[PDB]
């Protein structure tokens, strides 16, 4: 077909054009050492579509009367080959003096006469930079349809560069507004390693920092998938996103880098994330090929709302059909186009989404034509043809204007951009292929249609960060900038001493602190002080039991001449009752502030009087036993021998053994007054510490053995009626003793620590009360209410 | 003017001697003069004149040049068109330039990286060789992208490596980065980011400085911006601060830092401001900290000190404005490189030169090739286009007897490491290296616990008992102790635990064994003395096979001590947990049924003769003994199968060395279960005998049942009391002691009185005495 021949047409004024028509294979891309020409040997449909769009625009402009009446606007095109060398060699021919093959190095622009009025610019940002810097010296206006990078905005270096697409800064302002709307204050930011991604990160980070959005991590993903280094790099990026606990990610990248990242992201199993895409890859004909996409998570991104051109596909097919006729040849820039048939340019390729860039090319041609229309001061159907315009004259008319595309109006702003507007489009996964849903629009502010949003589940996802700690918390900064904190609570036993933004301070030994505390509080000392409401009952019981003891003693002294008392043990009985009264009073060593004296004294001071008392009941049990269970022929001798001085001998011997064991306890296992700062939550414990409770048996074994021997001496005995039964009283007394001190151990082992002394006091009191109630009380009861029995015959 | 000299071959030269309505393009002269441009231009002129004087380098050939005062970004393009022209002003456009001959054969290119890339893209299609002297941008290494370009300087790669190796040498682990908004700052900050994490250093934070300028007044928002940055500096624990910025902008930043009363940092200065006089002269900087700077090493040109003292090729104020050592050698070596490459291209030897027309691409092909020694330094181009020149680190000094900047290290790019570091006079109290690290190092036996994102952030936590720290294996989790070892919490190693069990060396153990032996031999004597009097009424009424087998069982039960004592074995553990209790229990059950028979059986016979008629018919007492025995069998086995046949290990309550080996680890639980039934039998027999207290039918049996069961009951209650308040080693030996004491309770308290009557009251053996009870 004759395509390549259709890339030129004469006119009174001529427009230049650079398009990605051609390309060269990878084998060509070696380092270059000799100044030969590049072998352009491939074809693309995108370049031909854009060239056809320009051809359509100029054809329409020449058909109508609304622009440039009475003049024929011409055009001819070159291919960039996506190659700077070819691009420069091509663009030089725009500037070369018309009708000749050379360019002259005049020192300023006014001396040149270029052969084109304006240049419809290249596709990619790299060539946009390269050619804009070059053209600026000649002040020839250039209108790129695709180059969105923001560095091109600078009027100082690019005074003659214009474009019909928004700059990246507007898109990223939209993205920042989106993050700001959902309060997504904590995000990761990722860009591709090429200049587009690095500049994208530079723009987005500035905007986010300015609006207080905190970037958890910022980094670049590689463009290549060839070696283990790249796999490790993407694994490290995934690690960064995972450890930072991000949920929203901004990915401003070119498509191949995103494909490389996503393919490995699917593999490595990272949880779904919210990805804010970019127009540079949200088109995603490539990305749709992945084996899984639903596990990636939600994808959102702003997409341009340029106008549609229904006529364009019919135009393309019409001209392709015309280019089959050989008659035109009776009347290269790209040789490879001639090999292409209509089946290679199917309508399915035009239905790719490319409408944005096609319409941008159309609008670019209309912008140049309208600028010339203003420059020629046209009346309706009449130009001011008195002059021939040079480009630097058109430039001054280009800035202030407004121009109309097909049913749309535009203006070049103060720095050569256009004020276009956006759709917020999101992917939903229910269909076999992902469906783009419009869910909002941006025109300088975000007009979200929030009710239509198909989140996973039915609620907004979030990642956020705490901007300020509560007063009782310790800070710790995080983020790429130190823009935000995470909070530490002061655990009990620590306090917020300073704004030391890493760790809390432990509490002092003399003090305590609760949760969330700013400062500590001293801990009070604790012990069984006098007047404690439970100890008060013991202090009453002490008086009650001592009162019983003293009442019995007084009654015995009152009736001292009567048989009952001598039969009960006479002076031994009285002495034992006095010893029991003294035993009760040992309670008073325990309460109050502990001391080194009482801590050591308390146990002997308790058990010695009790030993003295119990010896007499043991002797009465011996009397009962010798009176009932031993042969008379030496029972009488023992009975008459043990009574009297030898009873005092037994008393002294028991006291001496008890005292010796008390000394052995005071040397081998002595207790101590211990202060504990840890065993209580808000207090300091003061208590008499015992090394181990099994060591306490030294002062017990004597009394326990005496009690057991008494019980064995009394339990089996029985007596005639009409006589006093000592056995019942002694039996109940020893039984009560054993019940008391069997209860003593498990209670002492299990009461809360601070109350332990109360158990010992209570044990002593209850033991003495039992002995009194069983052995003495019935005797005094009979003495008071029925003295008639008080006789030698009844009691002896 | 001096901007041009003729010759057989010409070099282009672009130097920034200086710095719109956009149609009003300004002339380069309309901006302030910059002295470094004069220095560099005079360096090129000196090099070319010297090469013309050296008859051995270009014999019979004169080098010329055309120099243009490019104003640092603006007014590009015009110089390259001026250079590329074929004749006068004209440049032809064509497909192939392999036969072309431009006005100049090589270009000594601009300084600013933006301008270098701008010029390189235009020269590339001709492959006219360009050499540049100060553009450190790392992107210039892409010779697919910039085939025509070479450099007489190391790139930003080696500067960043100098910084990183400085940090490694002094072990700075935790740094701050500040960058300008320029491409310079952002590029170098990302490159530092790529080098740092790779080697274990961590950046605390990075932030962009505002693009202030020193002459104008500062706006309120810019003021607050600087305040906000300095606040983050003052709050952080890091103190190494790396600054990638042009020099002119930092004056405001350091004025603010001074105003904020900041101090104590180490400032590492990049190439762009490491040697700035203006910043150095800021009077009060010396209080802030230590200033270190990476810069290319100075090489003195011998003759230069004397030599220095239609448009865009003229100047009016250069010298009087003057009235750069570290870059002059780069300019000098670039010119000498072109000269040597030309000498090779002409195939020349002393006085044999043939004066070809030379095409630039061949001169490039030769410029890749030169290798020679210049001024006692050897220069050749790496395939990536860089000449290897040394870098150095300079500390700023405010003593003006010496030079303002003092060298303290040198970096060799070919050996690629920093060498012969000298004394750096720090700001600290005694010149101790100023440390900055995120965290303190672990103490012995402490694990790490990561915090946040960065590797340097971690807590230190002690290992728990049963675990230990092994630096050879890990530090982020503890290693477990072997099953026979333990650890003292925070420790680097384990220690061996010790097993404990009863053995005969111990005083209480041998004492208990001797007590059991006394019981055994007394029981055997009782048995034999009963057998010797099988005919007596005593043995007829309270003897026979029941007592014979009771005594046999009891004396074999006395053999418990060799089974309790000594290292445990499974069969002996089963024996302890079932067999000894089992054979001991039935004897107590016999005492119980005898306590029934003595009194309660008669109560049954009188009150409930039907039940008594059944009881005598179905062998009541023997069946009862068997019944309770099988109940005991169930009770023992259901505990043993729930706790295991083998011996078990338990921890000592407060001694870490000891592990206690014993049967029945759920002691208290089984203790209660086993005694519950035995002590209920004890109580029922005890109460029955108490009811028939004085019954003398069986030779006053009730009294002795009472005594024996009293001993058993009190010993059992004492054991249950003791077990509520103790948990140590003595548990099992006290268990054994109580077992032996119960064996004694039975063997002596029940049988002994009968034997005492047999031995020492023999008249009671007569049937006459027995019949007195009837």
Author numbering:
A (entry chain B): 23 to 353, 367 to 388, 393 to 835
B (entry chain A): 25 to 43, 50, 52 to 340, 358 to 371, 381 to 831
Provide excerpts from the study:
Sugars and other sweet-tasting compounds are detected by the sweet taste receptor, a member of the class C GPCR family. The sweet receptor is a heterodimer composed of TAS1R2 and TAS1R3,3,4 two type 1 taste receptor family members that share the distinctive architecture of class C GPCRs: a large extracellular Venus flytrap (VFT) domain, responsible for ligand recognition; a cysteine-rich domain (CRD); and a seven-transmembrane (7TM) domain that mediates G protein coupling. To address this gap, here we present cryo-electron microscopy (cryo-EM) structures of the sweet receptor in the inactive, unliganded state, as well as in the activated, sucralose- and advantame-bound states. Unlike other class C GPCRs, such as mGluR, CaSR and GABAB receptors, where agonists stabilize inter-subunit VFT interactions to promote activation, the sweet receptor is activated by the rearrangement of a TAS1R2 VFT loop, which destabilizes interactions between the lower VFT lobes and the VFT–CRD interfaces.
We first determined the structure of the human/mouse sweet receptor in the absence of sweeteners. Through 3D classification, we observed substantial intrinsic mobility of the receptor. The extracellular domains tilt toward or away from the membrane, with an angular range of up to 11°. While the orientation between extracellular and transmembrane domains can vary, each domain remains nearly identical across individual classes. To improve the resolution, we combined all particles to generate a global reconstruction at 3.1 Å resolution, then performed local refinement focused on the VFT/CRD region or the 7TM domain, obtaining final resolutions of 2.9 Å and 3.6 Å, respectively. In the unliganded (apo) state, TAS1R2 and TAS1R3 show a highly asymmetric architecture, and their extracellular domains are markedly tilted relative to the membrane plane. These features differ from other heteromeric class C GPCRs, such as GABAB receptor and heteromeric mGluRs, which adopt an orientation perpendicular to the membrane plane. In our apo sweet receptor structure, the two subunits pack closely against each other at both the upper and lower lobes of the VFT domains, as well as at the 7TM domains. The tight packing of the sweet receptor is facilitated by interactions between VFT domains and CRDs, with the VFT LB2s held together by loops extending from the CRDs.
